[PDB]
């Protein structure tokens with residue numbers, strides 16, 4: 001722990017007693033680990049509080065029923081009902097259905113968080129450190145980083161710990177500190193001490209803070225603090241209310257829930273108004289307001305039934321369920337609305353290098369100039385064995401292993417690859433594998449130098465650790481790297497200014513070693529090196545070099561190519577200003593061509609299959625890369641974006657070609673082109689921007705810092721697990737698996753969510769409407785009451801609870817990935833879907849009423865009398881109108897209220913079976929595709945059988961179970977409602993794109 005950023009670079013090194021270039025010894029690391037602990041915060045085991053998870057009572061709908069149960073609890077405490085126990089069942093029934101959905105909701109939120117945190121720990125954060133047991137930089141777990149050791153940081157790296165800057169290898173260092181200071185744009189760092197000890201974080205310009213990202217440059221530093229002493233560690237739980245808001249779909253349903261409230265409220269008030277006639281009816285005797293209290297109970301109870309109380313929980317469930325499914329496929333969701341938005345995605349933008357490709361780079365081909373004689377130019381081509389970063393391979397010429405030192409051109413080629421390089425190799429002992437340190441492109445050159453061994457260095461007797469950078473270290477001991485002009489994606493090249501290491505025997509020449517994009521580098525070459533000789537760049541020589549480059553990139557291997565050049569006579573250092581990066585290209589002119597390297601970069605296996613699935617799902621895929629167009633087009637053909645011979649004359653554009661187009665043509669090009677090569681980070685963001693101008697949901701996939709602007713711009717940013725931290729920071733999803741196939745699954749899963757949310761709405765509306773229609777159909781036709789305040793709360797608990805919620809666990813539709821992406825601005829309920837809600841709601845209302853009437857009109861146990869209660873409901877006892885009223889008490893009979901109560905339950909469990917798919921029949925999608933639903937149906941049916949035969953309960957819910965013959969009628973009328981929907985589903989199936 002060093003608490004001072006005011007100390008100099010020497011004082012920091014002296015404090016921990018560590019050598020700047022060597023790092024902490026193994027014994028030092030041991031002590032510092034005991035004294036300062038592991039560089040790990042606990043992560044806080046209390047991610048959530050059990051009860052805090054339980055608070056699912058925030059939604060308006062839960063609050064309504066919450067209050068609704070209260071009024072029935074107040075109406076049960078004092079008067080307002082004679083038999084109190086039955087009135088004490090009312091609020092407990094309402095509480096019962098809420099807790100059921102609450103348990104379900106709490107459960108899924110619990111499973112999600114657990115699965116999320118488990119997936120987050122799969123890949124241990126690694127850091128680059130110099131330590132005494134190794135000459136080259138090595139990679140260790142970030143938690144094993146202790147205060148005092150030398151840590152190396154590069155572009156795209158997450159800063160592993162609080163670090164005092166010792167040396168900036170680049171000409172500048174920019175850092176993204178938004179996670180700590182809120183500074184939107186990157187800030188510049190230096191090495192000079194900031195004298196003030198109490199200085200705020202924004203002024204610590206000689207410090208790197210853990211959790212921040214290196215925007216540009218490369219630096220060497222020493223850890224000041226780790227663990228909880230780290231600046232970002234103190235503030236993680238320090239401030240609250242920084243959490244996420246509700247998703248677009250969730251906001252869409254919130255709107256929907258309130259509109260339902262206004263309708264149901266109107267209806268409930270309307271139910272109260274239409275029944276102000278039975279004000280003074282003998283049921284409550286002669287009552288001026290007591291008669292209203294009962295119908296106020298009816299209105300309130302009808303609300304609770306009609307209100308989709310399960311809706312708030314089923315959204316959170318479907319979301320948490322989707323996340324958990326994604327978690328199983330090693331996909332990390334950093335932003336909740338990522339899955340629902342991806343479901344309605346029409347265009348997927350994807351980076352090529354590292355994203356569409358495995359980023360396991362290995363130079364397998366390279367050439368230098370052989371002979372130059374007029375219009376004649378011949379090249380010395382070479383092949384390199386080894387597809388890994390391992391320093392094991394051969395340099396083949398004419399299918400013969402050769403010594404690269406034999407060719408002077410290869411000597412300088414290897415020199416450039418070694419010096420003009422900000423990467424290295426580190427052997428990981430754990431299951432022994434050579435790992436890259438930095439960018440894969442540069443490491444492929446590092447392993448090349450090792451394979452070439454141009455100075456015949458004895459490497460046989462070296463360990464696998466030393467061997468990783470054996471030949472590279474030899475070259476570095478021959479030329480002192482003064483400074484480095486960093487790789488810039490505008491000039492697309494990189495150079496290093498070097499002087500002879502001896503500096504005593506040799507002072508003959510300073511050199512600039514340049515590598516970069518072939519086209520750019522070659523253009524800035526005026527000379528061509530032939531061994532140790534140098535000749536002027538001409539037409540024929542230029543054409544020869546370029547044509548071979550075109551061959552490799554278009555070939556069956558599709559080689560990523562780099563040109564390597566040298567400035568024989570560079571400007572004196574005084575004439576060079578390292579301040580502006582725009583003048584670096586000027587410094588990299590009058591170069592001497594040395595050679596061209598060719599890299600193998602295999603596409604990921606699952607990409608080709610995934611693209612076809614995207615094409616079938618109406619999702620378009622565009623490749624966006626800074627690489628050569630020839631190789632980009634060739635890869636596009638290799639992965640299926642383009643056919644093998646599509647001849648895509650107007651479907652592929654370079655950054656130059658794209659800019660030469662007017663704004664209108666650029667915007668239109670993004671519609672037709674599926675391949676953008678040689679483009680800058682700004683182009684990637686602009687392409688996504690154009691696609692969104694057509695009101696499209698655009699997704700972006702990348703791994704580098706050149707994808708960062710486009711990742712933040714797109715609807716959904718998806719990062720690679722092996723990618724940079726800058727890209728992950730700018731993303732909504734992270735694929736730790738590096739599995740591109742998960743994206744297609746993520747799209748599919750999000751559409752199941754929407755469709756399941758649809759079927760949930762389709763079930764509850766079309767069923768609860770039928771409940772409402774029933775109440776209206778009886779009160780208007782002048783029939784006895786079908787239901788009672790208690791009975792109303794029962795058909796709610798049974799039909800609007802778990803059988804409703806279980807629809808959230810519905811399987812994806814059969815043609816879910818054969819239909820086009822849903823437009824984001826589609827109406828939640830289509831104009832025609834609303835007709836189903838009535839067509840089903842109409843029959844349910846007519847089924848529940850016909851049941852209570854059939855007891856009155858055709859039941860043998862009942863009176864069995866013909867039409868319409870002998871035309872009126874007036875009768876009650878003898879001596880009223882003598883219209884053959886042989887029957888005495890055939891009114892206020894509890895058996896038909898049953899009959900309605902039982903049809904209502906049965907017909908909704910019946911209706912729920914239609915909510916397995918939007919338009920697919922029960923034939924193609926049988927009931928056993930959802931076991932969770934059938935269990936809820938059985939539970940609801942069993943709960944209804946229980947409430948009817950357990951003798952004290954019939955007294956409460958008023959039910960003499962006319963068991964055999966009448967349940968048949970209940971089952972009989974409830975059955976066509978699934979038959980009708982089956983016919984109703986067949987219509988829209990065939991009506992719209994049959």
Ligand SMILES: Nc1ncnc2c1ncn2[C@@H]1O[C@H](COP(=O)(O)OP(=O)(O)CP(=O)(O)O)[C@@H](O)[C@H]1O
Nearest residue numbers: 352353487489492493494515516517625626627628
């Ligand atoms: N370290 C490096 N030094 C010099 N040139 C480099 C380099 N890394 C890449 N280049 C070259 O610069 C070109 C443009 O760089 P850029 O980073 O924008 O594209 P890219 O192909 O490497 C990333 P992607 O394909 O993921 O978008 C590359 O095509 C490559 O030829």
Ligand SMILES: [Ca+2]
Nearest residue numbers: 304305307800
């Ligand atoms: Ca309800």
Ligand SMILES: [Ca+2]
Nearest residue numbers: 353354703704
């Ligand atoms: Ca990349």
Ligand SMILES: [Ca+2]
Nearest residue numbers: 767768799800
């Ligand atoms: Ca219902």
Ligand SMILES: [K+]
Nearest residue numbers: 711712714717
């Ligand atoms: K974004």
